[PDB]
Chain A
Amino acid sequence: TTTLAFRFQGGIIVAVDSRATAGNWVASQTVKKVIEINPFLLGTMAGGAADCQFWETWLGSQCRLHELREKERISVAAASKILSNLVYQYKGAGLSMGTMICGYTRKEGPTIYYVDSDGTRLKGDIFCVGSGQTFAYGVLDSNYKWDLSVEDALYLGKRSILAAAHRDAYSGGSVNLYHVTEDGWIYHGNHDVGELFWKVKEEEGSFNNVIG
């Protein structure tokens, strides 16, 4: 899978691919790897499909219970730590999860937390997760600056997933884009790689390795 999230001047960009595999069998090209926990919180999924879907859906329930009890939106820190403490209980049992918890709150500002199934929890500005993470990192790190336009940042996230979809055999299908602000997350569409690749090739003049 390839998933990424990064912080910049205008908030957070989150982009993921849509492929599910069973070994070399391509099980699906239409999976949703972003979960919308609330209007200010997003979760990304990489690893076991069931593990990710079940526990991130469960996380949504625990975040909802927090706001009923405390009359206040859960912090990104607290939400990420609920998931990391849960997987830590299951450590050694064989769960497979690589996730990013991305959101805005007034007290924290825009925040990204990496959480995985061996128990690691890390705050940071940039993360790429999954089988195709290295390919995304290659494009992302070279064109990254703090002060991209929202338009340029959305494109870079889209382009980094495209890069990984191309090179990584276990990533592909389509690109789902999100932008997180003060006012919440905004969906910026599903982009099929079968059309996007050729569009990007022509307009950008990239992918000169391919017969086009």
Chain B
Amino acid sequence: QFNPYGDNGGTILGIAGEDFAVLAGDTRNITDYSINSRYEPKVFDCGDNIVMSANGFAADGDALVKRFKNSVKWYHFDHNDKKLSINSAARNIQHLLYGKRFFPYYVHTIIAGLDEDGKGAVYSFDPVGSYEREQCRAGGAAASLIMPFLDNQVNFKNQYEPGTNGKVKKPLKYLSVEEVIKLVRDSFTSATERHIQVGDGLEILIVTKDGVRKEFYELKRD
């Protein structure tokens, strides 16, 4: 029997700051135990200061990103070059995903950017289009490894003020872009050590009011 789905591996990570947001993804693409590519970009600038990644089955991922990029183009045409806000992009993506409710896109999608108050925003989607805004999200093969670390280091979960017995929580803070990138790099270095499908390279897209910047880092190739 023909199986229309596959698994291309890979892992992605979104973190929202005070006046910025990052979307990071490894550059490795795999099937079974073979490496298809060591550098196959997975996180994309979609215009209007929005970055997107649809990790999982790469053919469905590419199809979804391609359709969303096109949705942005037609939003400009139909509404007088108006900027598509991150909240509006998210709702549009829900309808793209739920449109294939009974033959789903096999992906976990993350978008990142700035909200209409200039604050950092990360949205997260399941395969059939349920979504939520969050400070943190990891998706893909090593999500189970990375997310608990982010709960601890971004949202300060299970951390208390020393000497208060255990009744004052560590107060929540926004992290600097330098501090976020440190957490991103350590997350992927850790994931690469323990997950076989994670490795080769790390590509981070950083979104600010000034625009979209890129950073690339080597990961272990075994």
Name A residues whose Cβ lies closer than 8 Å to a Cβ of B.
Answer: 20, 22, 25, 27-28, 30-32, 48-54, 93-94
Contacts and interface: CB of A to CB of B under 8 A. Distances in A.
A53 B134 contact: no
**Which interface residue of B98, B101, B130 has the most chain A CB atoms within 10 A?**
B130
Nearest to B95: A54
Contacts of B132: 20, 28, 30-32
* Nearest 5 interchain pairs by C-beta: A49-B130, A50-B130, A50-B128, A50-B129, A54-B98
B221 to A, nearest CB: 29
Nearest to A25: B144
Contacts of B102: 93-94
Contact of A50 (B101, B134, B144): B101
Given A30-B132, A31-B132, A49-B126, 14 more contacts: A22-B126, A25-B144, A28-B134, A48-B130, A50-B94, A50-B97, A50-B128, A52-B130, A53-B129, A53-B130, A53-B131, A54-B94, A54-B98, A94-B102
Given A25-B144, A54-B98, A30 B130 contact: no
Contacts of A94: 102
A52 B94 CA distance: 12
A141 B106 CA distance: 42
B144 A48 contact: no
A211 B128 CA distance: 41
Interface of A: prevailing SS: mixed
Nearest to B124: A28
Contacts of A25: 144
Interface residues of B, number: 13
B148 to A, nearest CB: 10
Contacts of A53: 94, 129-131
Nearest to B158: A194
B88 to A, nearest CB: 14
Nearest to B102: A93
Contacts of B134: 28, 30
A11 to B, nearest CB: 29
Nearest to A32: B132
Given A30-B134, A93-B102, A54 B129 contact: yes
A49 B129 CA distance: 9
B94 to A, nearest CB: 7
B38 to A, nearest CB: 29
A94 B129 CA distance: 16
A25 B94 CA distance: 22
Interface in B19-53: none
A30 B133 CA distance: 9
Contacts of A50: 94, 97-98, 101, 126, 128-130
A79 to B, nearest CB: 21
28 contacts: A20-B130, A20-B132, A25-B144, A28-B132, A28-B134, A30-B132, A30-B134, A31-B132, A32-B132, A48-B128, A48-B130, A49-B126, A50-B94, A50-B98, A50-B126, A50-B128, A50-B129, A50-B130, A51-B101, A51-B128, A52-B130, A53-B129, A53-B130, A53-B131, A54-B94, A54-B98, A54-B129, A93-B102
Contacts of A20: 130, 132
Interface string B113-137: 0000000000000101111101000
A94 B98 CA distance: 14
A125 B220 CA distance: 60
Contacts of B131: 53
A30 B101 CA distance: 24
